[PDB]
């Protein structure tokens, strides 16, 4: 689980 | 269908020039850095905070939110450093000799090991930026097409075609000839690909610096690196 | 001068009657290959190859014209990407496959992987675009001149005006094929940006070649081993 | 180095 996964959504 | 293939040469022009991140600082402390520790540390930290603003601006690139999640982590895994390096020519294009990394944080060559190479391959770059008079438009039009471009491997074809007319579009409006519009498009095309060429060497030298432990590094950070990988 | 009074036409000719011959692997199906063997296929091929580069690199119009330390520097940066470029040339009629040699092609199976899916990527590209021999030539002439120009100031200046003649030859190109101009730009940056591939291509193989060396099992050249020196 | 004398010859 990326961080760019997390920060793209938001 | 795309919102960005319906846009104008104007709207996508207004689009990226609304979607630019902010210039962000370094820290304060006039102190100049001479060392590894320091200096990376500075660099680093900067980039960290960079990222950030770079994932909210991608999102604002017309073309970039048709894509799915995966595709969209794919291009900035790809791109991130080729991104921040144009940024960091860009606002250095005015200080020839030196790179400004932020407005508060202006390093010279006389700088660290082995990054000397990549210093002034910035600097070369910078300069021919300089020299050819870049705009601020042509610039973001560039920044686009690096995202777009560099991890691209047909909507996202068709997008940067329509960049493509942008750029042209600025080159006409700015009084250009027939012939030294293409002539101007495939020189700054081309300077993608020494840009391409710094980031990989960027890549490896981020990689150094990792198994070096000395400098911290964010999670962030270390999974874009990761992902070159 | 000399390359800056050609004609768009007789720029063509030149890097057409300049173009190198394709060369045989020593690959034998009979013969059991290690993935050692495989590799040492691969860089024997690209010794031989350089010889004829070399020469090739002579006849690129301007390219004559630069001393001799630049004309290195220049082959020294470039000459992965400009074997890379020919190879995707000629696998532009065998989709799903690269023809390292007319006795040596190969699918992804057999065939590191990830390089080797870039270079499957790349000439599927080239095959929709139906890119053209005289575009093909004009790429290779462009990758030799640019890839080291921003590693006297004189020098660079001439090698910039001899890239913006072969941006004449390619829309030249462009517009005898019936484009329009919007056509014409669109197809050119699309082109140039395969370069932007090509160059990211030759960056990981270069490293590929640095581990092969370290791990002293594949044969690697004298010539070979000097390029990689000189990339590092 | 090679790549020096082969464009010199
Ligand atoms: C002369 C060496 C440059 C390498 N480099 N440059 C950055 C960087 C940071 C912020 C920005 O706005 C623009 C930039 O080019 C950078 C960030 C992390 C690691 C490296 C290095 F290549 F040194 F590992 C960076
Ligand atoms: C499966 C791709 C590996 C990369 N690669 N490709 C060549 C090569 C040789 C001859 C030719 O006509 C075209 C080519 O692309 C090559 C040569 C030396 C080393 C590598 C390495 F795998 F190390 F990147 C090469």
Same mark, same amino acid.
């Given at each position: 689980h990326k961080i760019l996964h997390r920060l793209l959504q938001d | 269908n795309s919102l960005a293939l319906s846009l104008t040469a104007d709207q996508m022009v207004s689009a990226l020039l609304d979607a630019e991140p902010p210039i962000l600082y370094s820290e =304060? *402390? $006039? @102190?100049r850095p001479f060392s590894e520790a320091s200096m990376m540390g500075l660099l680093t930290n900067l980039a960290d905070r960079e990222l950030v603003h770079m994932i909210n601006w991608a999102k604002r690139v $017309? +073309?970039? #939110? *048709?894509? @799915?999640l995966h595709d969209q982590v794919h291009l900035l895994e790809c791109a991130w450093l080729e991104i921040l390096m144009i940024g960091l020519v860009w606002r250095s294009?005015?200080? $020839? +000799?030196? &790179? &400004?990394?932020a407005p508060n944080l202006l390093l010279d060559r006389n700088q660290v090991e082995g990054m000397v190479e990549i210093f002034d391959m910035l600097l070369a770059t910078s300069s021919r930026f300089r020299m050819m008079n870049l705009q601020g438009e042509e610039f973001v039009c560039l920044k686009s097409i690096i995202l777009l471009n560099? +991890? #691209? =491997? *047909?909507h996202i074809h068709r997008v940067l075609d329509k960049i493509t007319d942008t750029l042209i579009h600025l080159m006409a409006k700015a009084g250009l000839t027939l012939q030294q519009q293409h002539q101007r498009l495939a020189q700054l095309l081309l300077i993608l690909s020494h840009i391409r060429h710094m980031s990989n060497k960027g890549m490896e030298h981020l990689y150094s610096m990792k198994c070096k432990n000395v400098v911290p590094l964010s999670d962030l950070l270390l999974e874009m690196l990761d992902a070159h990988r």
């Open positions: - | =304060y *402390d $006039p @102190t $017309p +073309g970039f #939110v *048709d894509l @799915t294009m005015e200080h $020839p +000799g030196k &790179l &400004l990394f560099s +991890g #691209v =491997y *047909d």
